[PDB]
Structure formats: structure tokens, C-alpha cells
């Protein structure tokens, strides 16, 4: 209190109907553009030759209009199929397809009706205020390599924590958030802790 993608369809269709209406005032090489003024001041044998040029021109006008409507309806159908797919995948579910339902991690969507269309309101999560840390692939302890179950090992400069990858929430490294696999002599970048 924007909608140009909907105003474009309205404008293109009115602009085609106006051209179709206005081609009804060309002679196409006849004496008059109005059929009654050929019928009133001519007799059938010579009215016919003038009427045929008007028929030829107006038929071609009409055919051009119908072909360009058929090409434009096929573009509107692709749009409506995409909007049906967004209604199923963004309003009736949560999507993982990147950029399909807005920019960021999709949370939910709400539909709204428009004059010949639909407006989706996409709610997304956008991470903010990032900080720097030191990382390591694995920890070495007792000659064993430890990997995080779900997260990353981070250091604040002096201490090592595990955190989830999208929100900073540091916790102690225990045998409940890690698992073991192998020795600490094969992986490139193990640190001791």
C-alpha cells in the first residue's frame, strides 16, 4: 500500500484485441472499407470482386490473432503448472530444493489470491552475525581418532567444543557426541585434546 507480471498479461491481451478491432477499417485494396458502401453502389458481378479482397484481408487478420493466442496460452499453462507445483511443495510441505520457495532455508509458505494469479508469502530462516573459529577434522585421544556425531569441533583460542553447524552453541567434547574410528595417524589435521 510490484504486480507488473500480472499487468503484462492484461496489457498484451488488450493490445491484441485492439489490433483485431482496428483492422476492420483497412481496404486491403478495395474501394471502401465498409461493406454496405460496396453493396449500395455496386451490382453483384462487381460487388463480388471488391468483397473478395475484404474477405481475404479479414480472414488473415483473424488467423494471426488466433495463432498468437495459442502461443500465449501455452505460456500461461507453464506458469500455472509451476504455481500448482509450488502450492503442493511450498504450502502443503517443507521443501529442501534451494531457491524453490524463496531465498534462505524454507520454513513455510502462505497463499493469497490475486486478480488472475497467486501470491506466495515465503517464510525463510536467514543466519546472521557470524564469528571466526579454528577447526579440526578429528580429535586425537588415547591413540584414537574421534569424529563429531553431528556438528563441528571449534576452538575459541584455548578450548575445544562441539557445536551444531548453523547456530553457535558450544558444548564439551564427550564420548556421547563423538564416535571413534582408527588411529590418529592417517587423517590430515588431527589435533590433540
Amino acid at each position: 500500500s510490484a504486480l507488473g507480471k500480472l499487468q503484462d498479461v492484461v496489457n498484451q491481451n488488450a493490445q491484441a484485441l485492439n489490433t483485431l478491432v482496428k483492422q476492420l477499417s483497412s481496404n486491403f485494396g478495395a474501394i471502401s472499407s465498409v461493406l454496405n458502401d460496396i453493396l449500395s453502389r455496386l451490382d453483384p458481378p462487381e460487388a463480388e470482386v471488391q468483397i473478395d479482397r475484404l474477405i481475404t484481408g479479414r480472414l488473415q487478420s483473424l488467423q494471426t490473432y488466433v495463432t498468437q493466442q495459442l502461443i500465449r496460452a501455452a505460456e500461461i499453462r507453464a506458469s500455472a503448472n509451476l504455481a500448482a507445483t509450488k502450492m503442493s511443495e511450498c504450502v502443503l510441505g517443507q521443501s529442501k530444493r534451494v531457491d524453490f520457495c524463496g531465498k534462505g532455508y524454507h520454513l513455510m509458505s502462505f497463499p493469497q489470491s490475486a486478480p488472475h494469479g497467486v501470491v506466495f508469502l515465503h517464510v525463510t530462516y536467514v543466519p546472521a552475525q557470524e564469528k571466526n573459529f579454528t577447526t579440526a577434522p578429528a580429535i586425537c585421544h588415547d591413540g584414537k581418532a574421534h569424529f563429531p556425531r553431528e556438528g563441528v569441533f571449534v576452538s575459541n583460542g584455548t578450548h575445544w567444543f562441539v557445536t551444531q553447524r548453523n547456530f553457535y552453541e558450544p558444548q564439551i567434547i564427550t564420548t556421547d557426541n563423538t564416535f571413534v574410528s582408527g588411529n590418529c595417524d592417517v587423517v590430515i589435521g588431527i589435533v590433540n585434546n
Partner: protein
């Protein structure tokens, strides 16, 4: 001013790069600044080096909730023409 799109008269060629406003072509755009009409090479965006190293990581400490709109045409006007009466 001679572009690759043709010869352009009535616009000053500045040296700075803005976002594209009116597309001229072959990389040139025009805009009403300050008061006059100027023509420039468009800019793609601001530059950014990422502090990449082999033991550094960036982790976010907060978030925002974003809501954005998306508009789609579904339908058009149903029209008929009687071919004979036309």
C-alpha cells in the same frame, strides 16, 4: 559517444559503474543523475574476498526471519469471436 550498439547523442560518458538502469546494449546502460543523462558500463556487484584458510570456519550466532513475495499468473481472459460476424 560511440558504443558497440551504435552512436549515442545527448548523454555524457562517465567513468563510474552503477547498477543497470536503462539497457543500451553490449554492456552499456544509461541513467538520469545529477540533472543530466549519463552512460556507463554496468557493474555486476561489489567485490568480496572470503577469508579462506585450511583451519578457519565461520559460524553464525543469530538469525533473522524473512518473508518475501512471489507472484504468478494463473489464467487469462476467455474471449470468443464469431468468425462470420467479424
Amino acid at each position: 559517444f560511440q558504443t558497440r550498439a551504435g552512436c549515442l547523442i545527448g548523454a555524457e560518458h562517465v567513468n563510474n559503474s552503477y547498477e543497470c538502469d536503462i539497457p543500451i546494449g553490449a554492456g552499456i546502460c544509461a541513467s538520469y543523475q545529477t540533472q543530466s543523462i549519463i552512460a556507463y558500463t554496468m557493474s555486476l556487484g561489489a567485490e568480496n574476498s572470503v577469508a579462506y584458510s585450511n583451519n578457519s570456519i565461520a559460524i553464525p550466532t543469530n538469525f533473522t526471519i524473512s518473508v518475501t513475495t512471489e507472484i504468478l499468473p494463473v489464467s487469462m481472459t476467455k474471449t470468443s469471436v464469431d468468425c462470420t460476424m467479424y
